[PDB]
From Swiss-Prot:
This is RNA polymerase principal sigma factor HrdB. The lineage of its organism: Bacteria, Bacillati, Actinomycetota, Actinomycetes, Kitasatosporales. Sigma factors are initiation factors that promote the attachment of RNA polymerase to specific initiation sites and are then released. This sigma factor is the primary sigma factor during exponential growth. Its activity is stimulated by RbpA. Belongs to the sigma-70 factor family. It comes from Streptomyces coelicolor (strain ATCC BAA-471 / A3(2) / M145). Homotrimer (Potential). interacts transiently with the RNA polymerase core complex. Interacts with RNA polymerase-binding protein RbpA via its sigma-2 region (residues 211-347) in a free form. Residues 23-89 are annotated as: Sigma-70 factor domain-3. The gene is hrdB. It comes from the Bacteria.
Length: 89
DNA sequence: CCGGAGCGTTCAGCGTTCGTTTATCTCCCCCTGGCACTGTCATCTCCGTCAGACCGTCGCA
């Protein structure tokens, strides 16, 4: 489990994230999911900040860092030739 | 009728203040290493192209 999650931290994401930041973001994700299934609603970032004992600015920074890139080759729709990479200057 | 005083400008003694560095002390980031009841084979793909060719492949003759 240790080696698999270490390689998941160091290799799964294209923009590499250090292992401590990976465990921080997935702990935040799992406690957010727990609060969502308990309260039945999306938890406010302030309550997440108090329950994680971190500052709200740290919480929103963590949510910002927890993203996934989108490929430049995703088609828009019916047309195959018009790409997502040709709409950005 | 030069002489002195006051005034303008310009420099040599030491006296303080800056401009730019240096090693030490907190706070944080980041990577490698530990966990000891057992727990020893996933995963859904893919169908109502399509049109015929080009080609190698392959078992029957």
């Amino acid at each position: 489990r240790q080696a698999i999650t270490r390689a998941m931290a160091d290799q799964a994401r294209t923009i590499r994230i250090p292992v401590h930041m990976v465990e921080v973001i997935n702990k935040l994700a799992r406690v957010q999911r727990q609060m969502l299934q308990d309260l039945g609603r999306e938890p406010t970032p302030e309550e997440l900040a108090k329950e994680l004992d971190m500052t709200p600015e740290k919480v929103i920074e963590v949510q910002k860092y927890g993203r996934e890139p989108i490929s430049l080759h995703t088609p828009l729709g019916e047309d195959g030739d018009s790409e997502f990479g040709d709409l950005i200057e």
